[PDB]
Amino acid sequence: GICKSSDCIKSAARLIQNMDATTEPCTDFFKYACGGWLKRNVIPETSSRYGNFDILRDELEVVLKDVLQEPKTEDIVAVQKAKALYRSCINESAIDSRGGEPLLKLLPDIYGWPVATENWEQKYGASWTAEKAIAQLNSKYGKKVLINLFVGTDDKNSVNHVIHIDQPRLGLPSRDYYECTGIYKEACTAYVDFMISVARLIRQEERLPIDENQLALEMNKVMELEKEIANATAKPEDRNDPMLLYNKMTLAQIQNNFSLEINGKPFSWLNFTNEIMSTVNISITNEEDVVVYAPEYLTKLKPILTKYSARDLQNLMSWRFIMDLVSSLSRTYKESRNAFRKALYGTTSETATWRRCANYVNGNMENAVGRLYVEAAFAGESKHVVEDLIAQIREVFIQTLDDLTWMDAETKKRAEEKALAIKERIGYPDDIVSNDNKLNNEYLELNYKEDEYFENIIQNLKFSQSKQLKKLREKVDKDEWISGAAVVNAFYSSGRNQIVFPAGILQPPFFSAQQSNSLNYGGIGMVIGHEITHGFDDNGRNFNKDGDLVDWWTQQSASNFKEQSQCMVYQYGNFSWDLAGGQHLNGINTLGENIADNGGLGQAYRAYQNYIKKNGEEKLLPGLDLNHKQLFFLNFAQVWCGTYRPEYAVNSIKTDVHSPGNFRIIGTLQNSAEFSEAFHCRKNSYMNPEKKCRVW
Numbered sequence: 001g002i003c004k005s006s007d008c009i010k011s012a013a014r015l016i017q018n019m020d021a022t023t024e025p026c027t028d029f030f031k032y033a034c035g036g037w038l039k040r041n042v043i044p045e046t047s048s049r050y051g052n053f054d055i056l057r058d059e060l061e062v063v064l065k066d067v068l069q070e071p072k073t074e075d076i077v078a079v080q081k082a083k084a085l086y087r088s089c090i091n092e093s094a095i096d097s098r099g100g101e102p103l104l105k106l107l108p109d110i111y112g113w114p115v116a117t118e119n120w121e122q123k124y125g126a127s128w129t130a131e132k133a134i135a136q137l138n139s140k141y142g143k144k145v146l147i148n149l150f151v152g153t154d155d156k157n158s159v160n161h162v163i164h165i166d167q168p169r170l171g172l173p174s175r176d177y178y179e180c181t182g183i184y185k186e187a188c189t190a191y192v193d194f195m196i197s198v199a200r201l202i203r204q205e206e207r208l209p210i211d212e213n214q215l216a217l218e219m220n221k222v223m224e225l226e227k228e229i230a231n232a233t234a235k236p237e238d239r240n241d242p243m244l245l246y247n248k249m250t251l252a253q254i255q256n257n258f259s260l261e262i263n264g265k266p267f268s269w270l271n272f273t274n275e276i277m278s279t280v281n282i283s284i285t286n287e288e289d290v291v292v293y294a295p296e297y298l299t300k301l302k303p304i305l306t307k308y309s310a311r312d313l314q315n316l317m318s319w320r321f322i323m324d325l326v327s328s329l330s331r332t333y334k335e336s337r338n339a340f341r342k343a344l345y346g347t348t349s350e351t352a353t354w355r356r357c358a359n360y361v362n363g364n365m366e367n368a369v370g371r372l373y374v375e376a377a378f379a380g381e382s383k384h385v386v387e388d389l390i391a392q393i394r395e396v397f398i399q400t401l402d403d404l405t406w407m408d409a410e411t412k413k414r415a416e417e418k419a420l421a422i423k424e425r426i427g428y429p430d431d432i433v434s435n436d437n438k439l440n441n442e443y444l445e446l447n448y449k450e451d452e453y454f455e456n457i458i459q460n461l462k463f464s465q466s467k468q469l470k471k472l473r474e475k476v477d478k479d480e481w482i483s484g485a486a487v488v489n490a491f492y493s494s495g496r497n498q499i500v501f502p503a504g505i506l507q508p509p510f511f512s513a514q515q516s517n518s519l520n521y522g523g524i525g526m527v528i529g530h531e532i533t534h535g536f537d538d539n540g541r542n543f544n545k546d547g548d549l550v551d552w553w554t555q556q557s558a559s560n561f562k563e564q565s566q567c568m569v570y571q572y573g574n575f576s577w578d579l580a581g582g583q584h585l586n587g588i589n590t591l592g593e594n595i596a597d598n599g600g601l602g603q604a605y606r607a608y609q610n611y612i613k614k615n616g617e618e619k620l621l622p623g624l625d626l627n628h629k630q631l632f633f634l635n636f637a638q639v640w641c642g643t644y645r646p647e648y649a650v651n652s653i654k655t656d657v658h659s660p661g662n663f664r665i666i667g668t669l670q671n672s673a674e675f676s677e678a679f680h681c682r683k684n685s686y687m688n689p690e691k692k693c694r695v696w
């Protein structure tokens, strides 16, 4: 009575190899499920993290290399362009012989980099305004510094686009780094050293004299300014309520409420916005509505920006852009970035050039690369099997509403309405394979030169930003996918109320049409429930069935949501991570993902029990003394096997909205009675605490 198929054999071998059966599952299910994987594996020198997800992504890059590196006679133009882009990227000889010349050509167009410019004040500081300098980086290169203005979806009218104003992203991974002490000290040192090294290279290439003390002076003031910006930004915990974050006002009101004096000139918000929007021939008057996400930031900015000159600001502004471009330059320039990445992420080697290039082409031509990927690597008939599993789990979500005791009836009815409305996107959009005209037209305005990698990447920057700006007066395309197909991930879009399962994640261990259903439900089923539950977490619950930010909760039910989810805030905030030197997880910043994990696993498990009821027990797996309820949880845990470099562990505690895999495993299983039943865990053993958190 044992499954002896090839697909059961490959699954069982993977399960056996990764687990450590000498650990008791009720004491540490992470080491039980992953201890064998941890023993066999070391983090690659090129990675700051390693594990199941990272391995599948590495294996996906291999497929990408295979399809991009050989031209074929039948290739449509969209495909010719992806392969040409790839070839331009991996030609290090062409890149190396240009040195930094492609950046030197570019710098005048952004008002220069003062530290690497002689007589900057005379050349650029003469006509320099904050309106023009910020807008130029924004509109031409998509780089948003000091004031982050972007065109996006209106949270309260999800079919329209609207201009937003927000705080900018920083050079270091989070605002916490700018304390620059203890665990952040080496990163801060490496960051300013990075600045200095790139300034030195540019000056050396321009044949300017190198004054090390003056380099240190100017770049430490860049850091001093950015420390102020960082401290003025709101924390993630003060941005996690989308009802509070949304503030719509007119441009007239913005001028009245957020005045700025920069380089001694009164900042004209209308002139700044028009410097950007004129790029795509759109005129803006002072009655324009604008969603301001960071009003407090703009307020604290006022005393900051009176203290700095045009030259101080431009040294930061140009550096933030140059930082993003160094990896498209010669090996000498990359060597300065390699040094900063080591200090920051703990890697000791740069990622293989072909891998970086494959990922770059994938990120910029997601539909063309997706077509090549699915034709080489994706079954196709599995699209329908996954369809049916989503059907089952969505229904499990709706049925569970009845049993929840902390919602009232009106709110349950609105929750059911939203769940029924979720659109699902599985695998890939069929027309990337069958509609050559549409695919070619997506890249029609791009033309790549095979010896001009830098020119090619600048073209992608311009083309993407101009396309985004042009959406201001257009409706949202409901047919658009929020991810390419060649992606090992899954997503939920609150604005579109849509779950997406790219083909890259529809493979073992998550899913195979020939592996045991216990594994599929513990793998892709739990992921399906995770993404559905995102529509109902501390962010998604605020958006209705059409993706509009509208309150559909009664006061009591909303209050009870907060009560139930507070349990998980304490639970995960109490986890100490050794890899991060004992620092605690942020239970607030990871709450949404933790809610999705705990809700998703329960929905998947109940769907699997339904499956057993309607179909009977599955054949056991050879070589494993586990029943299928145990295998369900074993496979769920093995999805998250992995480990982290110390440097990246402290990074991810501040920047990752997810818990680390090993606490996703321990936390959710601690909260699951069904897990402790499956493994006969004694009361109050580590994996089975008496107090258990439950939202969905």
Ligand SMILES: *[C@@H]1O[C@H](CO)[C@@H](O)[C@H](O)[C@H]1NC(C)=O
Residues within 6 Å of the ligand: 087, 091, 093, 094, 451
């Ligand atoms: C790389 O570019 C150089 C300069 O154009 C060219 O001579 C060489 O053939 C290219 N190499 C490949 C493999 O295309």
Ligand SMILES: *[C@@H]1O[C@H](CO)[C@@H](O)[C@H](O)[C@H]1NC(C)=O
Residues within 6 Å of the ligand: 231, 232, 300
């Ligand atoms: C950050 O700014 C706040 C007010 O915005 C101020 O109270 C605090 O001292 C600043 N922090 C540092 C490190 O300067």
Ligand SMILES: *[C@@H]1O[C@H](CO)[C@@H](O)[C@H](O)[C@H]1NC(C)=O
Residues within 6 Å of the ligand: 129, 131, 270, 271, 272, 274, 275, 278
């Ligand atoms: C913005 O103001 C500058 C003066 O600093 C002016 O030269 C420019 O034409 C204005 N641009 C727009 C789009 O209003």
Ligand SMILES: *[C@@H]1O[C@H](CO)[C@@H](O)[C@H](O)[C@H]1NC(C)=O
Residues within 6 Å of the ligand: 569, 570, 571, 572, 573, 574, 584, 587
């Ligand atoms: C740990 O849990 C206790 C009680 O459950 C809670 O009061 C405390 O705030 C938690 N600690 C953190 C850092 O979340």
Ligand SMILES: [Zn+2]
Residues within 6 Å of the ligand: 530, 534, 593, 596
């Ligand atoms: Zn998630």
